[PDB]
Every structure is written in C-alpha cells, then in structure tokens.
Write a protein that binds this ligand. Sequence first.
Ligand SMILES: CCCCCCCCCCCCO[C@@H]1O[C@H](CO)[C@@H](O[C@H]2O[C@H](CO)[C@@H](O)[C@H](O)[C@H]2O)[C@H](O)[C@H]1O
Ligand SMILES: CCCCCCCCCCCCO[C@@H]1O[C@H](CO)[C@@H](O[C@H]2O[C@H](CO)[C@@H](O)[C@H](O)[C@H]2O)[C@H](O)[C@H]1O
Lengths: 168, 126, 606, 177, 53, 459, 99, 62
Amino acid sequence: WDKDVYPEPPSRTPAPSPQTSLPNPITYLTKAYDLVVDWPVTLVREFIERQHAKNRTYYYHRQYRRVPDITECKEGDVLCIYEAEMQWRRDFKVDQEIMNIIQERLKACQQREGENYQQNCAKELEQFTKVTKAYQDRYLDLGAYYSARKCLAKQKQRMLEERKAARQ
Amino acid sequence: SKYKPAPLATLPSTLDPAEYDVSPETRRAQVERLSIRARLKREYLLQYNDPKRVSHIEDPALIRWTYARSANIYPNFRPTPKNSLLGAVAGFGPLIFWYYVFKTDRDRKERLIQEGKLDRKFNISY
Amino acid sequence: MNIFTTSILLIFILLLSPILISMSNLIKHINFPLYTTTSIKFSFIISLLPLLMFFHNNMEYMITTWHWVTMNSMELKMSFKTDFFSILFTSVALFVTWSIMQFSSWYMHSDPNINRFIKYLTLFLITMLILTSANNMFQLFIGWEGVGIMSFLLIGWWYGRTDANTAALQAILYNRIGDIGFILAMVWFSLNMNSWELQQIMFSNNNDNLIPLMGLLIAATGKSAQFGLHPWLPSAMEGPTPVSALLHSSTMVVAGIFLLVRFHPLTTNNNFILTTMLCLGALTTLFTAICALTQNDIKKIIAFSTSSQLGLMMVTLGMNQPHLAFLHICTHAFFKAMLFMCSGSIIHSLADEQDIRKMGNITKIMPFTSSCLVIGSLALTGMPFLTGFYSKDLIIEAINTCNTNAWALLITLIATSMTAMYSMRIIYFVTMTKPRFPPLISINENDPDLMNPIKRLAFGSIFAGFVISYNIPPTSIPVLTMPWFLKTTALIISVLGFLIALELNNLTMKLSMNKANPYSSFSTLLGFFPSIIHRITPMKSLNLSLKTSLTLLDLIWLEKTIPKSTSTLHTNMTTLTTNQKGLIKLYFMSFLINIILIIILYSINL
Amino acid sequence: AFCAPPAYLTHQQKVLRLYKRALRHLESWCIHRDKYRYFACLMRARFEEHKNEKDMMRATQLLREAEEEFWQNQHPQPYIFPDSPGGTSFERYECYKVPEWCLDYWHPSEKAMYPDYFSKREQWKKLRMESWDREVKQLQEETSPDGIMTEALPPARREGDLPPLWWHIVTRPRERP
Amino acid sequence: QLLREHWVHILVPAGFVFGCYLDRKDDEKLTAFRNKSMLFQRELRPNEEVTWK
Amino acid sequence: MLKIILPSLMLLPLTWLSSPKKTWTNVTSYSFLISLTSLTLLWQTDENYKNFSNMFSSDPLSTPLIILTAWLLPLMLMASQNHLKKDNNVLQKLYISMLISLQILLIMTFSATELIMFYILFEATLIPTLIIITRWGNQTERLNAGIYFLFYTLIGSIPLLIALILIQNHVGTLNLMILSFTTHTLDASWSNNLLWLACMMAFLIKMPLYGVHLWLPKAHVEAPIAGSMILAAILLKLGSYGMIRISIILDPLTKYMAYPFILLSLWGMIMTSSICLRQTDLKSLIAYSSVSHMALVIASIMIQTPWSFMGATMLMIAHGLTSSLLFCLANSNYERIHSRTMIMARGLQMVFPLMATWWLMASLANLALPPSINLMGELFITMSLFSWSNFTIILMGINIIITGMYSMYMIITTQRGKLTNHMINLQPSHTRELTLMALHMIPLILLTTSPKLITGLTM
Amino acid sequence: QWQEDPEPEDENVYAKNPDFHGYDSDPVVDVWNMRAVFFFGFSIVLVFGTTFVAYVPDYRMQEWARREAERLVKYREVNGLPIMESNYFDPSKIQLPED
Amino acid sequence: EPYPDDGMGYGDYPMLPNRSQHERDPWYQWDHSELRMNWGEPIHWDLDMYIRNRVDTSPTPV
Ligand SMILES: CCCCCCCCCCCCO[C@@H]1O[C@H](CO)[C@@H](O[C@H]2O[C@H](CO)[C@@H](O)[C@H](O)[C@H]2O)[C@H](O)[C@H]1O
Ligand SMILES: CCCCCCCCCCCCO[C@@H]1O[C@H](CO)[C@@H](O[C@H]2O[C@H](CO)[C@@H](O)[C@H](O)[C@H]2O)[C@H](O)[C@H]1O
C-alpha cells in the first residue's frame, strides 16, 4: 500500500465524551473481542510471519525497454510491426489499470466524504474527467481489432481536425 | 340468455341448447361415442394391468399428433395467394421495420457525433 | 473496522453453514430444522452488533471482499454496502426468518423432505441478504434473480399440483418482465458511468437519468407487484404458509421498494419519475384494497393487504421520503409475518381449511392465536403507538402536507380506510361468529414451536416500531404543523372504515338474500385482470409461436424457398438432360449442331 | 370418481345436479348457518312446487329457465372443498404417491430393511399372476355381442376368482402417503 | 508373462513424449532472432552460449 | 501443440489394439489424460500469443475451444456406452475411432495458423460427422438430415474457398498473423462486397444464421447422443471462430454489410425462442434454443466491439457446455422410454430426484442465472448491442422473457406434475449418466468462479 | 413378409447384477470402468487441473499491468505530469500531410 | 371433420372443438390424468396450448 498512489486522508475521530450513567455495550463487546478473537488470531499470524522470515524469497517487477514505435518503421515490415504492436498492447493494458486506479480513487472518495461528496470529491471527480477525456481520445472507437496502426490513424485524424480548426 | 360466449369464455353446458335435445338420433350418437370410449378404455386397461407387461404403453394417438405436427406439415402444403402473402409479410416485414428503426437511430447518432453535439461523458467501454 | 466487518461476514458464514451441512451425511444424524433455526438465531444475535454500532456512530461501510474479474477498465469485485438500510433490514429479516423457521418445524412436521424445505428457506434468506447488501448492480442482480428462482422452487413446493406450477411460472414471468428494466438500468449505467458500483453511480446526479430510472421503476413494479404486474403475488399463495409468510410478504416483495430506496438520490431530481411512482402506488393501493374486500380466503386477503401496503410504500417514494418508505418496510415485516403465521396456525388446526366462510368463533376456541391475530390486525391499521403507527401515521401526514396529485391523495386515503375495512372483515368472519367448521374438533395450539415464534413476532409488532423510530438517526424533516383534521385524518379514516365494515358485516345476518352486484363481482374476480389478460395474451402469443414462426415460416416457406427449390430445380434439369432416345442419328445431329455453332463462333469472332 | 359416467344424463339426474349446485351456491351466498337453512328450505319449496309435471316439454323448459337463473345468480367465488377439484390442497399429495411398481428396482440392501413387507408383496404378485389369465378370459366371454359397450366391469362370477382388472383399483397409492 | 495385455499402455505416453520431442525440434528450427530482437537483447552472461536454447 | 495432437492420434491404435473388454476403459482414461494435458495452453503470462511453429498457434480465443474439445471426448465416449451396448466390437471400435478422429481434426482446426489449413480441416470434420449421424441414427430421416447437414455446409464453403484463393493471390499469403499486421482498408466496390459475402457466408451457415438454420434441428433430431453433443458444442462454434478470425481483413465494409445479418440474427433469436415454446420434440426444443442463442453470437461478432467479442466468446463456451448437458439429460429419458415427445414423460422428479437436480441446474444455466458465465456473455452482448443502438434492448428483453418461459416450461412439463405411472421401464439413474451430468456441470461452476479464462482476444 | 427378425424386448439392466453402474454387463469390467472414470475425471483432471489453472501466475499480465500502473501513477503525480495525455504518439514523430 | 382445404399443412388431421383441458370432467379417471385425456382419444391440434397449465377457456360468471 502506497499512500501516494492510493491517497487516504488522515482520520479525525472525536473523543468519547460519554454523558450517561449506563454502560456502553459496544465497549465491553469490543473488549471481549480483542481478547477472545483478536489475540489468538494475532498469535497465529505472528507465527506464520516468523515462519515466512525463514525461507524468504524475492520477486522482481519486470522492466521492458522501449522499442521503435509504429511510426518509426516501414509499411509492411512485419518484424517492426510486431514489436510495435506488442509494445502498444502493453501500454494499452497499463492505461486500463491506470483507469481502474483512478476509478477506485473516485469511489473511495465518494464513500468517505459521504454526504459531502458533492463538494469534497471535486479533486477526484476532476481527475476522473480529465483522465477520462485522455483515455477517450486515445482508445475510444477502435474496433475489437484495435491496434497501434488504428491508434495512429485516429490520432492523425484528430490532429488534422485540430489543425484545420486552428487555421479557421 | 344474458351470457354472451366468447372464444376464450366458451358457452357453458347447462346453458347449451344442444344438451337438452332428447332426439333418438342424438341419443344414438352419444351411445356410439360412449361405445368407442368403452372399447378404447377396455384395451388400455387390459394392457395396463397385464402382469407380463415389461414396458410402457405406446400411444398411437400421441404418435399421430406428433407426426401430424412435424413430418406431415409439408407434404400437405399448397402455395396459395394467402399463404404467399402471409409468408412474405411475416418473414420480411418485421425485418424491414427493424432495419428502418435501427438505421434511423444510428444515422441520427452518427450525425450528432460528427457535429460534436453528443454528450459522451464517461463512455469508456463500448 | 475489524469487529464490524467480521460481524458482517460472519452473518453470511453462519447462514451458509446449514447449506453445507445438507451436502454431507451429518444431516441424517442431526435434527436439521433445529440446527438451521439455531443458525438463524445466532446470525440475528451477531447482526445485532453492527446495528448497535450504526445507532451509536451512524457510520456506513464499503467492504470489498473479493476481486472477481477485471474487464478492461471496469473491475467487478464482490462489494458490500452496509449503511442504514442494509444494517436495519438484515436484523429485521433475520428476526422474521428465525420466527418463521421455528414455525415451519411445526407446520411442515408431517411433510417429508422438511430438510429440503428448510434448505430452500435458508437459500432464500441468503439471496435476499445478498440483494440487500451489495454495492455492485451485478451483485444486486445476483440476489435479484436468485430470489425469484427460490420463489419459484417454493411456490409449488407440491409439484403434483398443476395450479401450483402455473403460479410458480406466473411469478417467474411477471418477474422477468421487470428484470428487463433492471438489465436496461445496468446497461445504461455501464455505458454512461462505466461502473456498476453505487459510489461511482452517485456522480450521475446531474444527468438526465430518465432511461435508467424508468428501467429501475419497471423492475420495482415487477418485483414488488405494482398494478401493472401484480397478479402473481396474490396467486403466489399456492405454496406453503411459511413460504407465504416469509417470501411473498415479509421480505421478497419489498425488493422493488428497496431498489428504489437504494437509488433514491438519483430519482430525487427527476420529477417525472417521482410523479409516475406516486400515481402507480396510489393506483395499486386502491385496486388491491378493493380486491381484498369480498375475498373468502384468509391467505388471499393477507396477500392483497401486502400488495396494498407495497402500493403505499410506492406512494411514499413518489413523494421524496425514501427513508420513511424503508421504515415502513421494516415495521410492516413484523406484523405481516405475524398475521401469516396466525393464519397458518388456524389453517393447520382446522383440517386445512383456508376459506373464512368455514371458520368463526376462533376468538373463543383459540384464545392465543386470536389475540396475536388481533394485535397484528390493529398494527396493520394505524393503531396508535404500535409498530405500524410510526410508519403509517407519518406517511399519511406527509401525503396530506405535500404537493401531490389530488386523485392520488384521495384514493390513497380511501385505500387507508379499506385497509381497516378488510381487516375487520377478517376479524369478524374468523373470530366474531358462531362456529362454521366441521363438527369433529381437533384444535391444538399448545406447542412451543408454534407459540414461541408468534410471541416474538407479537413483541415485535408492539415495540419494534417505537424502538427503531427512536434509535434511527434523523433522516428527513417532517412537517408537524397542520390543521387538526389533517393531523388526525389517519385515525379518523381508520375508525370510519372499522365502523362501516362492522355495520355491513352485521347486516349479513339479516334474513335478506344477497344479490350479485357489478362492483362486488369486480372486487371478487380481481377486477377481471387475470380472467382477461391471462387468457388473451398467452393465447395470442402461443398461437403466433405455432402458426407463424414454426409452421408457416420454419416448416413450410423456409423449406420451399431454399432446399426444396434447389432440389426441384436440379431434379428438373437432370430429367431434362438425361431422357436421350439412344439413337446415333440424333446424337450425330446434335454433333452437327455443335460443329455449326463452333464455326459461327469463330466466324463472328474473326 | 370410482364410477364411470353414462352416455347421457336423464332429466332426473340433471335436475338433481342443478339442485345440489344451487344449494351449494346458496350456502356460499348466505355465510351463516341459520340463514342458509332458511333459504335452503325456500329453495326446496321452489323445487317441490314443480315436482309433478307430466309435460316433459314444460319440464325441460323449466329446467332451462332454472339453469339460466343459476348462471345469473351463481356465487362468483363459490366454496370449494379443500380436496375437491379447484380447491386449495386439491392435488397437494400427488408428489408422494409413488406407484407400487417402483419397489421392483430397490437394491437388495434396501429390501433387507423390510423383510416381511416384501415377503407379503411376493404373495400378492403371485396372486396377480395366477388370476390374470382367468380374468382376461372372463372379460372376453362377458363381452356383449352387440357393440353397445360400457366402462362398467363385471364381478367375479366363479369361486376363487378375483374381479377382472382389479390390480390398479387395488394397490393404488393411499390418499395421504 | 502378462505383457500381451498390458503393453498397450505405452502408446499414448509414447505419443506424448514424441510430441514433446517434436516440439523441441520445432523450437530448434526457429533459432533465428534468438538474441537479436529489439527487446530482450542483453549480452550473453559469462559462460552462457544461448539465451533460451 | 504436437504434445496434445500426437497422443490423440495414438488413441486410435489403442482403440484398435485393446482387448474388447478393456477398450472403453483405456480409451476414456487416456482421453481424460489428454484433456488434462491440454491445460498447458492456459500458461500465458504475457500478451504474446503462443506460436509453437509455422503451422500451429494458440490465442485466448483458441485455447478455451481447444480445451473444451479435448474435454468433451471422454464425455462423448461415456455417453455412447449404452446405445452401443449391442453392436459388434468392430462397430464399437469404429464409433470410437470416428469420435477420436473428430477430436483430432477439431484441435488441429482451432490451432491452425493459416486460413487454408483452417478450411481444409473445418471441412474435413464433415466426414466423421456424416458417418456418425447416418450410420448410428435410429430413424429413417437420418439420411435426409445428413444430406442437409452436408450440403448446407458445402454450398457456403465453396465461396469461402474461392475467397481464400483470391486473398492469397492478392496478398501473397494466408497466414493469419501476417494478414492481421499488414491489413489494409477495402474499397467499397461491388466486387469487394461480394468478397465480404463469400468470406462470411460459410461461417454464417455453420453458425447457423436465421434463414439457413433448417439443417440444425434435423441433424439434432436424427443424430445419436454423441453426434448431438459434439455438434452443438463445437461444430456450431466453428462458424463463430472463423468469423472472428477472418473479419480482421474485411474492414471497413462490415460497418454497412452487417445490417442484413444483424437484423436476421436479432429477429431470428425471437422467432426461434418462440418456436421453443411449442416444439413437441425435446431434442428439437434444445436445437432451437441453440439457434436462438447463436443469434446473439452472430450479432455481437458483427457489431465488433471489445465487449461484443468477449461476450461472444464467453457465450460460445457457456453454450457449448450447457447445450451438451441438456442433450445428455434428454437422452437419459430417451434411452428409457424410446420417445422424444416431451409430453410423453411427466413427473419424472418423483422417480429420479437427483436427475431432476441436474435438470434444474441445466435449465437455470440455459435461462442464464447470475453469476453464471451464460449471463456474463449474454449481459455483455446486450450492453454492446445497446451501445450500438438503444432500441435493440426491446428485442433483447422479448428474447429474455421467452427464454425464461420456455426453459421453465421444459422443467415443469418433464420433471413436475403427476408421474406417468404406466411407464414400468423407468430404471434408476445410472452412475454413468449421473457422472456425465456432473462432468458437464462442474466445469461450468469453475469457469463461473474464474471467468478470466474464457474472455477472448479483446479483454 | 420378408424373413426379418422380431423386435427385441425391453431389458431390466438391474435385474441381473443389481450393482450395475451403467458401463458394462460384466460386473468386474463395469466397476473398473466406473473407477477409472471417477479417478481420471475427478481425482486427476478436475483437482489437479483446477490447482494448475489457479496457480498460473500473472495470467496475461493482469498483475504486472497493475504494478506498472501504480508505478506510473506515482511517478507522474510526483513529477507533475498528466496522468494520461491525449496523444499516445508524440506529435513530433508524426509528419502530417501538408494541408 | 377435417380442417378447411386451404393447404396449410393440416391435411387429414381432424378438427376438434377449441375447448381447454380445464373444461374436461375433473372427477373422471382419465388415462392421462393431468392431460385429462383417454388413451387412444384423438388429440387436439393445439393440445400443448390448451393443457391445464396454459390457455384456459372455461366459462365465466361474467
Ligand atoms: C446452388 C448449386 C448447388 C447444387 C447442389 C446442391 C445439392 C442439390 C442436390 C440436388 C439433388 C437432390 O435430389 C433429390 O433427391 C430426392 C430423393 O433423394 C428427390 O426426391 C423425390 O422423392 C420422390 C421420389 O423418390 C418424388 O416423389 C419427389 O417428388 C422427389 O422429390 C428430390 O426430388 C431430389 O431433389
Ligand atoms: C444459402 C445457401 C445455402 C443453402 C443451400 C441449400 C442447399 C441444400 C440442398 C439439400 C438438398 C436436399 O434434398 C432433399 O432430398 C430429399 C431426399 O432425401 C428430398 O426428400 C423429400 O422429397 C420429396 C419432397 O420434396 C418427398 O416426396 C420425399 O418423400 C422426401 O424425402 C427433399 O425434398 C430434398 O430437399
């Protein structure tokens, strides 16, 4: 869990401040819980983690070097096109996960802010809208056969339209 | 009578004029129908109670019904003006209707998108 | 929080334990009904803890338990949304189901496969809880469909009946007609907000939402049996009385109301949908309140009462009072389940007689069941300070003190009177008369499995409304300033209905023949809606499916046009070509023609 | 149910059926017992007034008028006995009515749990086997020459003979298994 | 011995082993580009003759 | 892939060399082991599809179909163990050989890399299917059913061969990967329209399309149980797979050439779901349900979206399992009463309590109960079509209602009501039959648990 | 009539060998066929197949893609770059046709 | 009485009254108990539409 990727604001819990003579059942139930249920489970987990400390192994996040893009090599060079298409598919798969991360951010903000979500989730909603526009301009309307070539064609059409409008 | 029958609310029997006719012709007809019922029931009960029976009782009436509704429909079909008109209408008219519906909807949507007036906001999956 | 989430998941674990036990050999060594009843009881006790925490701090949780599958920028993960509605409904439903599961051990004791019956009831409870506690529209739909399937399996528990099979398939049909709207809502939200989770849906507040809201409204109509798709609920009494008490009254039929309440923030800003809900609920209330009168079947009367109350909840939602509608759901569960349990006890004690024309004098011959029935009936009516009061009184007050359709308001008040009218019908014809039952009498209430659950539901119907209405956090701002007549309208109309029904019932003993009335027939025969629709619609549909698609097109014309035509063409060509006389004279004449043709070809081609 | 209907009903049968239906629907209209008794006495008075009518045409005319009146004044939702057709719990117990021949496929392990029952069942099957030929012969010889037949079956005429076609009438599943 | 009836239980396993062998041969035939793709173009580590054999 | 193909070949000598008593045991066990081996195709840890050689390959679309084909063969062998109980040993071995040869050809077809090899195998599968239907059917109409099944396919297939030859002449190759990577737009000429039709007609007929489906009810009604199983499970999906593969080179003509077939499928799904309400033969009812379900696959593949392709693949797999389960369930009653009429047998739950549970599960999968992969595929196809046009929801809802109605009608008619007591031959359910139903249902449950496996190329 | 054999009669499989499993008339072959089916179908294929499929790692880069997405989100937010930019390909790489 | 000779495939099959199975005598011992038909009795063309579960054509008080 990285807070920078998944920002979670600081909690702001009020003090108990009881104002009655009756006992609060939830406090005693939580005490009984922290004894019966929370403690043996904690001990079992500590034993499991102690066993994990021995027999410890590491796994690495693979790194892919950038290869020539689709734009950088010739029409009908299947080797180039295959390299560029695999790279484009990797970047598309990662764009999907960035989309998912930001959607999770928005949903968590809505749940947390609760009744103030209309006013205290402005940052998350604006991020969603901007990143959503970017995603649409990149990938929307490409067939089930989407590919780097189709993405390039879409970008070039959009650039031509923008240029024509700027001229006019 | 103040009760007017309908195809889905058929005329009762106690209100049926044909149930109160005592003519010997109708009486003979009813007796003949009961005789046919009795013969068929006797055969069925003999088969049903046969202690040596080792299988179910095949139903010639059911076989005839299934044959009529499946394999005998085409041999006894003759094209007619009404048959052809109904066939063409049922086969194609719905297709033409739904083609026009879908095509007009799609054309209006595409015109909207080309003009940029369609509010595609969070559409991301399509 | 660990404790809260642990309780929320442990409820489901406990409910699932009996289902697993039924797939092992231990079910033959244990007393399965008692084990399941204990499981429901302990699930209720456990659930009482999240309820207390919510009452204390009023916090709501979103608990993602499992990541099912990710579908390109849309992750489908098992998510539970535990807020006011889910937390309260879970406890109420668990209490009601504990009572009904204990009751069924007695009601169905003779019936073999009681273990299968208990398993089916537990499965329905599981699915209803899944429905009511789910962030995703997809998980909500899992619950939505499983509830209908368990309803099918329970209606027509006696599959030997053909009426029972018809009623079950009727429920399935009328529920799919609403599942179409549910799927419409799902697809619209998937395309326009790219998510099925309510958190992300909530940012659709400023859109039109007419299409998704109309889809949800159709689904709610179908599931909670509003006027358009109502016949199935009255017809769902073919199944066992415990099934009727639990599913088709206490929990299942409130699914549409729960769905609309869940999506209430979006429908707050859509006047068209609110107006449609108001009108539809008012119409359902009036129609089913009318139909309840002149019904000589205790279960049918109670089912029509349930339909009327659901219409009232729909009116409450037509007004922007979702919290009040949910409060009515929770309050009504208690006394409706109690009424159905009492009717089941009466029917069991008598030789399985459901018609009220062969009952009477139950007030004396069954003191305990009669007292519980009267408590439930007064609770259903607006008797002050009973579980019904803290919902019905406020609903009527809000109806009077709001900008509403005049006709909707008027017929809603008339239906509120008709409620007491048909309650008095039941009371009079099942308690305040001379005995009309067969002469041999074998009536035995004295059984703990019968007495205890009804006692619990009676304590509920007396105190639960008060306790909840005080514990729940403030939700909306009520209007407590109104003329005396508007304030006391609920009591006044309820008492007027009681008195009018009493006079009409007293008039039955007068030795004057009762002549058929057009309106009496309209009430008795359910407004002719079954008699007409259930005969014209299926007849036309099935006649099309046979005469058009199957016979005309698939068996005749699609055979003639392609395979038969091709075969005929080639069988004609073969006979045309292979009828040769076998004479060399003719063969060589043909060869001469071929030679001339070739010469001409060459000559004209140069 | 046990008896088979005739080719036709006579005037007496039709009138009696109408009387029974009219009294049942009158009971449905008059919920209370005393009121029902009063109106049932009146209805029987009406029926008896025309008990003597030697004009077999004015008898059929009276019957048809009465049937029209019955269809006009019938209870829209009459009272059906719980077990009768159309009544709640009609075919309720048809799920548990397993036919006797299902026991033939029981595993020996399952038959070992009822040693005496199957011992008696073998005797019953032996009795059926012995009787069948004689009963079919009895029916064959009893067949009337003229084709006018009926579903009514003959009793056992000789001694040591079971009634023809008895196996399904007997051994039928109990009403409440 | 009892071979005449049980020897038949070597065909399918033999087919599987032979298929693995043929797959390895097809792997050998496509040795080109072994360490010559724009991606995965590391230099051979010490005492290493082939990147993936 | 040869590690899967070769053991499948070795099954045949095993069948012909095994002793008559042990032949079924040996062949079934080794078919199960080959099905287990085929799971090595699921080890994909990157986006680079598996390319074993110049001649075979595996993608997320091919691997599910290959695994399903490998899995079915043991089930077909089990299902065929009773109605082949009386035939000569040579004849039983011939039937086993036909089924094994069908498995080998289908796996080769789904692993093929070239469209011409795909065509050769996809048309080679006809001979075993014709032999199985005609030589082991029970009625005199099996010959005409086989003629229909053969020539409906051949007529549509010849234009496919012509189109493939034309494409190879124009491009220089038929390798699917090369075609995909060097694809170029098609000018909207009449010749290119005819090329589109020639490329799509064979697969549409195989699917089948609404207008040319008359060969499928006949084949199902006249075929043996294994014939119906393999047909419904895989031979219908051949068309969808071919359409998905070959549509990559037919753009952009699809956008306007798909309307006739989108409309045909959308309307024919309703027109066949309706027939299912009043079909008297149970096998015919299952066949028409299959036609209506495949209409959805046709429409989704035609509209071509990331959602449509995934939904089509999921529905392909789910239908492959469910229709086969329904056919096995129907054949269980057929082997006992020797009649396909649905009304003939009733109240069967009173004598087969557990077979009734299998019936209920199969019917629930058929009507698509969440979270079943049936409903996953159907829902995503519905969403894609809704995005296409918002009025498709009307037809989809009508079809949903009719599907629920006929699915529950099947159960209510067959397993419920009052037992047809006159049937003394209703023997207790076989352990073999119950195992067959369990093997049909368990993979469905597991795939519902893990649906990521049966998404297609798009997602 | 031609010299044709009569239709064979219905048989009860459980009449002889009440432990029939539906597989074969010989009891030993039948039980062993049932055992082979249950072993190689459930014990082997389903259990081991399910475990293998479950422990297929990073099926189609589902996990690597999420890890990369987290890395990129952190990097881009730290450096102040847009999370996603509307141009996949740097517009400099593209040589747009004149006019 | 056969169907009208309009070439709609009916052929020789008889035409029986279009009366639902609901209207048959419920107290009789029908051979096909829930179909309310006897063995050998000719079957209506639309029997599966008129079965007791589906279309009902019984008379009505109104
Ligand atoms: C588009 C080009 C495709 C061309 C190839 C497509 C295949 C077409 C096959 C053509 C041959 C079909 O051959 C078909 O044979 C059957 C019997 O077998 C004939 O069937 C015949 O039955 C009896 C005699 O036996 C006659 O009373 C009947 O009128 C006649 O139809 C068909 O009339 C004939 O059409
Ligand atoms: C869109 C293109 C794809 C669709 C292509 C369609 C081509 C299909 C051609 C298949 C040919 C079927 O050929 C079929 O032969 C059989 C013989 O068994 C004939 O069989 C039938 O013939 C006649 C009726 O016409 C009867 O007298 C006979 O008893 C009956 O068997 C069929 O009438 C004919 O249809």
